[PDB]
A paper describes a structure:
CI2 is a small single domain protein of 64 residues, which has been extensively used as a model to understand key concepts of protein folding and stability. L49 and I57 are both part of the folding nucleus in CI2 and very important for the stability of the folded state of CI232. Here, we have applied an efficient in-cell assay in E. coli to select variants of the barley chymotrypsin inhibitor 2 with increased stability. We, therefore, determined the crystal structures of all four CI2 variants in the wild-type to L49I/I57V double mutant cycle.
Instead, the most abundant mutant after selection was I57V which can be made by a single base substitution from the Ala codon. As I57V is more stable than the wild-type this demonstrates the efficiency of the selection system. Relative to the wild-type, I57V is stabilized by ΔΔGf = −2.2 ± 0.1 kJ mol−1. Overall, the structures of L49I, I57V and L49I/I57V are highly similar to the structure of the wild-type with RMSDs for the backbone of 0.16, 0.45 and 0.17 Å. The larger RMSD for I57V is a result of the overhand loop in this structure adopting an alternative conformation compared to the other three structures. The Val at position 57 in I57V and L49I/I57V superimpose, except for the missing δ1 methyl group, with the Ile at position 57 in the wild-type and L49I. Analysis of the pairwise interaction energies at the residue level suggests that much of the stabilizing effect of the I57V mutation originates from an unfavourable interaction between I57 and Q59 that is observed in structures of both the wild-type and L49I.
Author numbering: 1 to 64
The structure:
Amino acid sequence: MKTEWPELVGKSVEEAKKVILQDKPEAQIIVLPVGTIVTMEYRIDRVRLFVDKLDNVAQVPRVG
């Protein structure tokens, strides 16, 4: 199972969603500002995108 998407740093949310859904059709994609604190529970189906002021992916997306 692919768990990380280093190739998406710098890319838009639209691009990131297209790629993650190709790779991971069940993905629940969540978009948060960089630095947002999340709760600890694990979801194998979730991929969070931490984005910058311009809605570009700012750090490597991972499952969880």
